[PDB]
């Protein structure tokens, strides 16, 4: 089964700022990382949301609606692992 060693860390983000959510997973085969925001897979087609590397998710110019829980999903045919962090976004 895939094992998540370092998971996303909770953070307070200001509106229009930039936040990064990283994730490190171990296993044979090499686990694939997927991101879920409030039970819905993070879009691969948003100009501001970039899935940099397998395990790193960057969100530039943060909206108020970006508030929620982000889940890091490590996938291989031998199982699946999850790690969650809540990201809150308030105005100035």
Residue numbers in the entry: 454 to 545
What did the published study say regarding this structure?
The Drosophila and vertebrate Robo1-3 are most similar, containing five immunoglobulin (Ig) and three fibronectin (Fn) domains in their extracellular region. Here we present the crystal structure of Robo1 Ig1-4 and Robo1 Ig5, together with a negative stain electron microscopy reconstruction of the Robo1 ectodomain. These results show how the Robo1 ectodomain is arranged as compact dimers, mainly mediated by the central Ig domains, which can further interact in a “back-to-back” fashion to generate a tetrameric assembly.
An inspection of the potential N-glycosylation site at N463 reveals no additional density. All five Robo1 Ig domains are very similar, the main conformational difference occurring in the βC-βD loop region. Interestingly, the βE-βF loop region in Ig1, which contributes two sequence conserved basic residues (K137 and R136) required for heparin binding (Fukuhara et al., 2008), is longer than those observed in the other four Ig domains. The flexible linker regions between Ig4-5 and Ig5-Fn1 enable these domains to loop back toward the N terminus before extending down to the cell surface via Fn2-3.
